[PDB]
């Protein structure tokens, strides 16, 4: 399968999440995603086919994971934007107030701005600290998906937010949205990954 940020994948044939970003670990191909998406050794499928397994994760506390892929997978420096793509150019962290977009299998590509950093989310499983908050909308299933600037700087992976009864927060004003992502930088250093760029 072609690995692109924002696309759907399933875990152990049950839950769905979205791919964050293509990365490498030496000769090993992988993708970063959210820790809450699967446990270590959980099987990831793309379009019905097994593509790899969860190599490591941290959740709660943090919300991060990487899936090691089979050799057959094609890693690409891109994030889905409808029928088009956003090229991943690096991982410079943007500041509060910067415009940012996110991609995921539920709400597609949505943009907003970064509103706060070092936010704690209290999930059913426990607290997740140090998240960055933006006001781009998202829905269940978008977790793990890419957060990136229009200029191609990868920011992090979707963790959570205040979804409403309809399953998303797109039905409320941006001023009222809390969409939280796990910063990419710590994931890369924790697992010794290199981002695939173009």
UniProtKB/Swiss-Prot annotation:
Catalytic machinery residues: 36, 63, 143
Source organism superkingdom: Bacteria
Cysteine-cysteine disulfides: 17-37, 101-111, 137-170
Family, similarity comment: Belongs to the peptidase S1 family.
Name of this chain's protein: Alpha-lytic protease
Origin species: Lysobacter enzymogenes
Shown part of the complete sequence: 200 to 397 of 397
């Amino acid at each position: 399968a072609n690995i692109v940020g924002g696309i759907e994948y399933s875990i152990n044939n049950a839950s769905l999440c979205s791919v964050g970003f293509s990365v490498t670990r030496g000769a090993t191909k992988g993708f970063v995603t959210a820790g809450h998406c699967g446990t270590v050794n959980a099987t990831a499928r793309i379009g019905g086919a097994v593509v790899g397994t969860f190599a490591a994760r941290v959740f709660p506390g943090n919300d991060r994971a990487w899936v090691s892929l089979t050799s057959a997978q094609t890693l690409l420096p891109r994030v889905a934007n409808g029928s088009s793509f956003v090229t991943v150019r690096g991982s410079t962290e943007a500041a509060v107030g910067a415009a940012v977009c996110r991609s995921g299998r539920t709400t597609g590509y949505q943009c907003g701005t970064i509103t706060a950093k070092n936010v704690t989310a209290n999930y059913a499983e426990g607290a997740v600290r140090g998240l960055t908050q933006g006001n781009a909308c998202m829905g269940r299933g978008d977790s793990g998906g890419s957060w990136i600037t229009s200029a191609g700087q990868a920011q992090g992976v979707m963790s959570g937010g205040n979804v409403q009864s309809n399953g998303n927060n797109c039905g409320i004003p941006a001023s009222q949205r809390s969409s939280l992502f796990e910063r990419l930088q710590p994931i890369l250093s924790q697992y010794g990954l290199s981002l695939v760029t173009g």
